[PDB]
Amino acid sequence: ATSAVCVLSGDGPVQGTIHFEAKGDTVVVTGSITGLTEGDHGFHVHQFGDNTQGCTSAGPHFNPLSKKHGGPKDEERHVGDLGNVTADSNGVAIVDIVDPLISLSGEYSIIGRTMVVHEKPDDLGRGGNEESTKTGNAGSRLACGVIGIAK
Amino acid sequence: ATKAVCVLKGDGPVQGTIHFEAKGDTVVVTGSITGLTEGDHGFHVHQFGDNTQGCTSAGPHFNPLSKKHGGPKDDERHVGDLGNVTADKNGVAIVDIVDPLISLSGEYSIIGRTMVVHEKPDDLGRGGNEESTSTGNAGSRLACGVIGIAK
Ligand SMILES: [Cu+2]
Ligand SMILES: [Cu+2]
Ligand SMILES: [Cu+2]
Ligand SMILES: [Zn+2]
């Protein structure tokens, strides 16, 4: 596919629509997320597109190369590590990311996987503790959705 | 990849969980759907995994070979034509299908697409009007979900 979409929903008020478009050897990720607390919120692709137990069954970060967690500009990061989105005072986060590791086809394809927006900021693997190098200390999963093929 | 799952939801009481597993050279579809009216209900793979407008944005039946609608055992059918599921008096439908045209990888892959359960029976392209050749006269989309990768 050349284009994909994901609608984020959860048990709280957070919701959003994320769009993905292949451009060159990158994916451009755009959209908006509402109902967030102002500030940064971790934003990752998780491994499974399984919503049978809400966002908990999505599993860990998508990591086909078996690396530690990092920020999107790091050499050592999960494929699913897209850093943070920032919500304003009204709870609105505008998403505008360009990433060369995620793909919409082939081995690193994210189609059929899950996008998750988290409770806290992602510390980008520089938190100093062990959880930092697994999840970035981003905490709970506020909302999630399976990434589907779009027109 | 080898296993997929879809959680069906809508605006009504209809809900369900569908599992997909590549066994040998075919795909086995199993699960159950609840909240249905007794009788047959059309059960199809629609093209887009886009739920921004509920099940409406899923588009038409997945049809890479550009054929008319039919039943699962016909030569002339859409790839997404999985026939009907049958609900008992309690509104429960058990899904147990083996299909040769769908896949979980490659050109026929349904990963990232949408599973839909419809309001009425699918007439299998035999109703005699133009609509029969598109949707089987299966009617409204009661519940749907995006098909994601499972563990
Ligand atoms: Cu995460
Ligand atoms: Cu990570
Ligand atoms: Cu249909
Ligand atoms: Zn059809």
Swiss-Prot record, chains A, B:
Its cofactor is Cu cation; Zn(2+). A lipid is attached at C6 (S-palmitoyl cysteine). GO terms for cellular component: cytoplasm; cytoplasmic vesicle; cytosol; dendrite cytoplasm; mitochondrion; neuronal cell body; nucleus; peroxisome. One of its GO terms (biological process) is transmission of nerve impulse. Chemical modification of Arg-141 reduces activity by 80-90%. The modification N6-acetyllysine is found at K120, K134. Destroys radicals which are normally produced within the cells and which are toxic to biological systems. Its EC number is 1.15.1.1. This is Superoxide dismutase [Cu-Zn]. It comes from the Eukaryota. Its main location: cytoplasm. The gene is SOD1. It catalyses: 2 superoxide + 2 H(+) = H2O2 + O2. The modification N6-succinyllysine is found at S3, S9, S89, K120, K134.
